Ligand SMILES: Cc1ccccc1O
Ligand SMILES: Cc1ccccc1O
């Protein structure tokens with residue numbers, strides 16, 4: 001049944017197996033093993049160190065995020081800014097990456113305001129980090145953080161930074177994140193400048 | 203229908219509300235092909251052709267291996283061909299590539315294998331062109347490693363494919379040939395990748 005909330009997203013997704021294809025509207029898509037991100041993670045971790053590995057993965061989340069936001073942005077006009085926005089959290093779910101449970105979410109584009117506080121349930125990345133590195137001294141959902149930052153930044157037309165305050169990878173129960181405009185914490189290829197600041201986590 | 207794809211489809215669970223997708227006990231991610239292209243380029247720019255290539259093949263190898271573990275559990279009332287086909291059928295469900303069989307000759311016990319396949323709508327050739335323009339060599343690294351991996355597992359031995367024509371070199375479609383390592387003019391997954399690259403430059 002429904003499950004009616006995300007139905008305009010699913011509608012957009014076509015599975016043509018006899019032809020080797022999958023579509024999210026115009027965009028072509030793949031169904032993948034999380035192994036290939038696990039591998040990328042092990043590899044890069046040792047070729048470059050952690051810092052550069054971390055950045056890379058925020059970058060890749062970021063571009064995914066931006067992309068989903070592009071593809072969904074005309075999509076919900078008879079709904080308010082927030083029911084719209086949630087497009088992002090929802091795709092993250094559809095794509096089998098993480099479950100988004102809204103603790104708080106308020107946003108106004110014109111007022112240039114944003115506050116998101118979300119629980120992140122069964123993060124695919126947290127699993128993957130643990131089964132290659134074990135318990136981390138810090139939160140490890142880098143790709144999911146990037147996507148968050150990427151997706152939101154587009155929808156809000158301004159830079160929006162998130163901090164994972166709890167992570168299953170540190171032995172918290174579930175991961176958790178808070179997101180505000182850049183301006184409200186402490187102190188293009190603008191896309192790559194943003195990646196850098198998500199790296200200054202606390 | 204998908205009369206012969208069905209058994210595979212019945213191992214794949216879409217749990218949208220929970221952020222989960224499953225194949226058997228394995229998690230899966232829906233991803234833009236254009237993000238793969240970006241990944242490919244960025245890796246290129248950090249480590250070079252050899253390593254990028256090396257990575258994508260090692261990756262494909264692993265996924266191919268895991269799938270073959272998963273599909274080996276099923277199908278055992280059928281014969282080694284109809285069973286083997288689970289692999290190319292997976293590549294299709296995964297939205298990766300479309301497989302068309304020219305010739306297939308296999309016997310686990312005989313240690314004989316020979317595959318000649320066409321690859322019809324290869325995502326990898328697409329994204330390669332986007333990033334790199336026309337190529338001097340074939341481009342389907344991940345698809346190839348997966349071919350090698352799936353096959354190697356399913357037979358008892360390193361089967362090695364060679365991409366013979368690639369859409370990215372301007373060919374009409376991509377095509378492959380698989381033979382056992384020995385028939386080429388061991389088990390280490392990172393050695394398999396070396397053997398594939400070493401070969402493609404001795405031809
Ligand atoms: C927190 C978040 C924000 C936007 C899109 C996805 C997501 O997980
Ligand atoms: C998935 C697969 C397996 C073996 C050979 C080709 C191919 O596409």
Ligand SMILES: [Zn+2]
Nearest residue numbers: 141167168175
């Ligand atoms: Zn986490």
Ligand SMILES: [Zn+2]
Nearest residue numbers: 327342368376
């Ligand atoms: Zn190709």
